[PDB]
Design a protein around this ligand. Structure first.
Ligand SMILES: CCS(=O)(=O)c1ccc(CC(=O)Nc2ccc(-c3ccc(CC(C)C)c(C#N)c3)c(C(F)(F)F)c2)cc1
Lengths: 243, 8
């Protein structure tokens, strides 16, 4: 591995991310004054639990679709066997979305971009998932304090996905090798840009694992309350990944 | 099977 090869991987990963980032950062930043009014917030809170769940599941599914495309364009991913591609996506797609979400989070007023405007965690009160919602908001707040560049998000999210420890992998060594190359690319880029200080401040794997576990648990609780709603009205991909 | 369709 040359330095030119590693730099090539950095730019390839960054490009793959740019092409699949869903919303341009500038578009998210331009909308920060566009905040849901007290009336619109009350509107969301009066919506039924199942309608709010369906809406959130739809938007997560949209976000996940861009992550799948990211993976498909990610150097080395499509060279892995289909079993391992699926394993990595099933375990990592949601984690990637949770990291990407810090882009749409405003730390100054603790709001997140949702359905055209910015709203606080009170917006989601109809879900009955207060602990999950506040955890997601806390995680996004912690990521916002790092002030990720887009390139850093690209490299970091590539590693969130390419994790050789995921149970069910048939070609573990192959995933190990790609992971290591992406670690070099990420760490080289941080060295070159004098940003190695963030390494110690990145959240442990357990934080992301906790969020995904809570999500799955709150889904199970809801699916017991409204089984036909999930069957009839939830996106197919969402159920495949989380049911 | 949705993941499968998306990957190809
Ligand atoms: C992510 C790529 S981006 O271009 O930066 C982008 C691109 C689009 C958007 C808008 C957007 O979809 N926001 C949104 C949607 C759903 C949710 C959300 C709502 C509730 C839940 C708990 C529920 C499932 C029981 C979860 C979970 N888990 C997630 C959120 C936020 F997490 F903030 F609450 C925001 C935001 C950024």
């Amino acid at each position: 591995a040359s330095l030119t090869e590693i730099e090539h991987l950095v730019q390839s990963v960054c490009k793959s991310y740019r092409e699949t980032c869903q919303l341009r950062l500038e578009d998210l930043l331009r909308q920060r004054s566009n905040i849901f009014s007290r009336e619109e917030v009350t509107g969301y809170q009066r919506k039924s639990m199942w309608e709010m769940w369906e809406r959130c599941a739809h938007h997560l599914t949209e976000a996940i679709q861009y992550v799948v495309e990211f993976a498909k364009r990610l150097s080395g991913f499509m060279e892995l066997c289909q079993n391992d591609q699926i394993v990595l996506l099933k375990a990592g797609a949601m984690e990637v979305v949770l990291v990407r979400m810090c882009r749409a989070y405003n730390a100054d007023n603790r709001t997140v971009f949702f359905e055209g405007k910015y709203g606080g965690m009170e917006l989601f009160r109809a879900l009955g998932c207060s602990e999950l919602i506040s955890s997601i908001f806390d995680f996004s707040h912690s990521l916002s304090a790092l002030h990720f560049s887009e390139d850093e998000i690209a490299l970091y999210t590539a590693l969130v996905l390419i994790n050789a420890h995921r149970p069910g992998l048939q070609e573990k060594r192959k995933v190990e090798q790609l992971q290591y190359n992406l670690e070099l690319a990420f760490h080289h880029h941080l060295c070159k840009t004098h940003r190695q200080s963030i390494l110690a401040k990145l959240p442990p794997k357990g934080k992301l694992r906790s969020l995904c576990s809570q999500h799955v648990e709150r889904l199970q609780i809801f699916q017991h309350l409204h089984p036909i709603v999930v069957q009839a009205a939830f996106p197919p991909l969402y159920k495949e990944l989380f049911s | 099977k949705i993941l499968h369709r998306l990957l190809q």
